[PDB]
Write an enzyme that holds these catalytic residues in place. Sequence first.
Site, PDB file in Angstrom:
ATOM      1  N   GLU A  35       0.841  -1.188   0.000  1.00 55.64           N
ATOM      2  CA  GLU A  35       0.000   0.000   0.000  1.00 55.64           C
ATOM      3  C   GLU A  35       0.882   1.247   0.000  1.00 55.64           C
ATOM      4  O   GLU A  35       0.659   2.178  -0.781  1.00 55.64           O
ATOM      5  CB  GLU A  35      -0.904   0.028   1.231  1.00 55.64           C
ATOM      6  N   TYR A  69      -5.019   9.536  -0.895  1.00 60.19           N
ATOM      7  CA  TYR A  69      -3.620   9.563  -0.460  1.00 60.19           C
ATOM      8  C   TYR A  69      -2.552   9.767  -1.532  1.00 60.19           C
ATOM      9  O   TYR A  69      -1.993  10.862  -1.672  1.00 60.19           O
ATOM     10  CB  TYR A  69      -3.294   8.271   0.288  1.00 60.19           C
ATOM     11  N   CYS A 115      -7.887   9.087   6.543  1.00 64.06           N
ATOM     12  CA  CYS A 115      -7.898   8.915   7.987  1.00 64.06           C
ATOM     13  C   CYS A 115      -6.586   9.464   8.567  1.00 64.06           C
ATOM     14  O   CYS A 115      -6.614  10.170   9.583  1.00 64.06           O
ATOM     15  CB  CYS A 115      -8.114   7.437   8.340  1.00 64.06           C
TER      16      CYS A 115
END
Lengths: 544, 545
Positions: free
Chosen positions: B321, B369, B429
């Site tokens: 990720e 992101y 988040c």
Amino acid sequence: MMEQVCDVFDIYAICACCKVESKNEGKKNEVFNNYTFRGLGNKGVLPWKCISLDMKYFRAVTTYVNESKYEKLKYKRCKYLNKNSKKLQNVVVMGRTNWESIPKKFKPLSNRINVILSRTLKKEDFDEDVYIINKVEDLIVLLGKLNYYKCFILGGSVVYQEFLEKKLIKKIYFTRINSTYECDVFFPEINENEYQIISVSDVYTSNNTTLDFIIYKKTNNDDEEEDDFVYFNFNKEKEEKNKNSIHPNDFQIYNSLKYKYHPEYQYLNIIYDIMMNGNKQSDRTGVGVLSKFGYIMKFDLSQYFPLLTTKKLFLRGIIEELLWFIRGETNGNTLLNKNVRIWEANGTREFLDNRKLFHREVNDLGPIYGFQWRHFGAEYTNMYDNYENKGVDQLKNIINLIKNDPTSRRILLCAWNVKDLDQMALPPCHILCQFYVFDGKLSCIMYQRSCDLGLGVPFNIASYSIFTHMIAQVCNLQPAQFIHVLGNAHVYNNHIDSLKIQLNRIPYPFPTLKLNPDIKNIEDFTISDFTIQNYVHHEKISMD
Amino acid sequence: MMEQVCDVFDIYAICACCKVESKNEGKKNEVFNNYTFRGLGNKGVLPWKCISLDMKYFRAVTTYVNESKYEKLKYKRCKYLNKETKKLQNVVVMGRTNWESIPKKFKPLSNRINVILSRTLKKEDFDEDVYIINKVEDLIVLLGKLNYYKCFILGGSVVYQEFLEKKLIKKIYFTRINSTYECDVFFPEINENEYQIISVSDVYTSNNTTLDFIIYKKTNNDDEEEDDFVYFNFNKEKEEKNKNSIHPNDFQIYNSLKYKYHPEYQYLNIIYDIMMNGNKQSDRTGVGVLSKFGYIMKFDLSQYFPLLTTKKLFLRGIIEELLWFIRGETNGNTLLNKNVRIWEANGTREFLDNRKLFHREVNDLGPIYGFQWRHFGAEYTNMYDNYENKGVDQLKNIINLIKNDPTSRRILLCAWNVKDLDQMALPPCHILCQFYVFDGKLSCIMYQRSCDLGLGVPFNIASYSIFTHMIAQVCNLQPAQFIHVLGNAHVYNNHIDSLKIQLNRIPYPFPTLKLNPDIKNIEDFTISDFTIQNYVHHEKISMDM
Ligand SMILES: NC(=O)C1=CN([C@@H]2O[C@H](COP(=O)(O)OP(=O)(O)OC[C@H]3O[C@@H](n4cnc5c(N)ncnc54)[C@H](OP(=O)(O)O)[C@@H]3O)[C@@H](O)[C@H]2O)C=CC1
Ligand SMILES: NC(=O)C1=CN([C@@H]2O[C@H](COP(=O)(O)OP(=O)(O)OC[C@H]3O[C@@H](n4cnc5c(N)ncnc54)[C@H](OP(=O)(O)O)[C@@H]3O)[C@@H](O)[C@H]2O)C=CC1
Ligand SMILES: CCc1nc(N)nc(N)c1OCCCOc1ccccc1CCC(=O)O
Ligand SMILES: CCc1nc(N)nc(N)c1OCCCOc1ccccc1CCC(=O)O
């Protein structure tokens, strides 16, 4: 003979003093000191309607007793005078007036050996349980004949005066009621060369007034797991091969306090920690600083307005700045016209040119805070353009989230617009705000990337505390906690000598913030809608 | 009440154990327990060359005495034997082999009274100031005669084994050396019904191995200011007014621990706090949670890699990720094709439709992101577009700031692009990162707006710790502190029982993270450049029902 009486019999004085009317005629900016809190009573009664938390404290202090620590005292007492029921208790001494003015239902004070100093009262129309004495000295006599843990002088103005000159007081448990009342009796001034404060409690709000508890001390002028503790510290530092240059007696008063629970210490401790462990770094400004990375402070806004009391602080400027933010303005002239010069240096031709903003008008700060709060994402032109309904109105959005979806985890206000940073006179110091709602209460966390502990931080704390109140009120909530997260926390070397002076000052109970209750929309606040009450503080300090 | 010999004479054991060599047994899925750490020696000497921090610890413990506490120990022992009322030292006992394994220059052990157990050797065979005893019974007689603080058994497996069998050990100061070495002698397997762990220290690194110190305890199977402290606590809660209906025994092991210094307790303690004081709230999900606002955890990356040990965690996915973020990708298929399903649920037709992203292709997560890190400000089109040189490349900017302007207080990475929020499968988040540089060391603070303590947080801690290592490396700095700041911290109600189980597990010393040193550009990392070593951990936990 250096075996003292108040030490032998453990005699303490416990009181509660409020503020007294400064007499219509005091000179300039009222000066404050410990003697500010001195009102005891008015017309044979307490100067205030009622203050339940002090009552709870008083009752708890004067009745508490430790049986497994008594033999030691009893050992000391007989060895000195050279010498039944068994619920070991305490001796609570009073004056006639004092005892008289106590409401019916409470006498004799539960779980306490009630004693009364009067020259006209007689032990016969009384019980035996409740003793009566002639003068100061017939008291020491009665303690050598009793089994008590500690003796507390509950007092009256006279009782306090006589016991202090007679040096019969070991400690003074002093409650500071931070509000004014008219009184005809006061607590004798405490000579600081005689008694000194060793502990300050947390600050509380009780019956519409803040108060705290301090302690005066008469100046002196299974443990396998106690070892396991030492073992786990085998790798610690300080042979005090010392660190930066900061000497012992520099923070004498600061280091001589046993308990420092006043919230202001969260701010003072960070300064102490930076001074003691901060890293020496050069900086964009070339002055030199001491810095550390990552600190947290938490203030309970439901109990006090955290305006620093160890030095004087003014709020008009920061409130006008906040209102300027809410309007979404970027025009530094608006503030300069009101003599709020917080942004002046960031808007000069030279500062702008240094930022390589050669085509920006002086005092046109670019897409800063205000613009981001009300127009995030809009294209910035100049400080005079019409941005109505352009960009994302974050402020409006968070207020709506707080009202219609309080459990959301997206209630954030972010001033750090990556795309616009360079166009700003300077990137925001206060990166973002996150709100939290529970049981009708609003809490706020603000993340700050750069913190000037000496000058900026005190103002930042006040600013967001006020802001949290504002948001709470226009959302029908009560403010709870304000949480300040500091990233790069620094102290300018030129601020050190001033901060040293500040750390050795003892906080006063905090003031409280009152907002015009009528204001119901975030955009309707004006400078007259804010009032700071009971701000008791030390004298001002120029940090530089 | 039959006063035991070990309590009267304060007899303790102190050892250091490494992991033993079974070899390529089944290291992929091997099981761990306290017996994992049991290697004492090899070929008459220590399994390892030199772990200096343990040496220091061992020395501090065995030579430390508290004078003012002796008068009472003197009475206790005299009372027991029915007797009466230079510098104080501790007595240390060692098997003969143990005595011979120590280098001459360290013998006799400094500031300690030396006692050696042996049958084949007598006092004539020793030039040193030492006591030779040929029976354990003789040690007791000796302790009766001497003036000493505490008695430490330094062992040899033969010595440890016999003092444990005789029930002469009051506490075991146990060092867990988290590395494997060839061994031939081992510490006896400790019986859980006899000794329970009461304390666990911080985790450290020394001579290329992490290690911690724990204490096993024998189970039973001024002072006026002390009062002021009671006064200032007059307003503290009642015991019945502590929020949630959580039970005592539910955290029996967890609460039995005296010292919980292992860094993993920063996580565990937050979970405990939320269960005990959390606010009951519903949430966007329906499950409902227990939440609190504002927590902070700090991990020292120079001493260990903080990968939770109270439950199994796999890092392949979160590493992939992270690489996916660094490349600026927003295509969920890329991760699915590497069999990483972290983002699968947020890319379904259903989820996207519920987010009003009807015109978004399945698995096209939007400007999340990765995109914000490399192209903040660019117009998102679809996950296949070429975004090169569009938007602000924050990642490159912060790397250049760290390198050329290290004292900058503006080194931040921000994924919270207020304008693109609604275009994102879901808002970020982990909101932002701020870096700090001093004396060739890099520290990082990450602010998390929403935190799922049960499933999210363990992985987030690991993620940013790895990221700090990566940034530090490509900038020629050493990683220091990873500071994690939590905003809305919650525990899903459906996770409570699984977490009750985790809280009663004792952490093991952390593993370490190794990065291919040849990688000097942030974008040049591949999954194989990452290796986690010595990850000793408890069993996998299904947070779910
Ligand atoms: N804020 C606080 O913490 C406290 C406030 N108070 C307030 O203070 C006020 C009372 O103060 P004040 O009027 O000074 O009264 P005091 O409570 O000090 O009592 C004075 C009376 O005690 C007696 N007395 C004084 N000195 C002596 C002595 N040396 N030997 C024997 N008896 C002596 C006298 O009785 P006699 O005339 O019979 O000779 C006298 O008039 C009240 O309003 C009460 O509410 C009281 C306690 C605490
Ligand atoms: N990791 C750690 O913390 C430690 C590791 N070690 C390692 O352990 C290994 C040594 O352990 P091990 O082989 O078990 O040996 P030990 O060190 O326990 O010594 C065993 C010997 O000690 C003597 N001995 C033991 N009990 C008695 C008794 N009751 N009466 C008389 N003599 C007694 C005998 O000496 P004799 O034969 O002369 O009669 C015996 O053979 C080494 O490799 C050493 O490096 C040692 C201490 C600590
Ligand atoms: C005003 C309370 C008070 N508070 C502090 N910190 N010190 C005192 N010496 C004091 O005064 C004690 C004298 C009078 O006490 C009372 C006055 C009015 C009602 C009840 C009580 C005492 C009740 C009790 O002890 O249960
Ligand atoms: C591995 C060190 C060690 N560590 C722990 N936690 N426990 C032991 N019982 C122990 O072994 C002690 C037995 C032998 O000690 C040594 C072995 C080799 C070199 C030096 C020493 C001790 C030196 C000293 O105490 O000054």
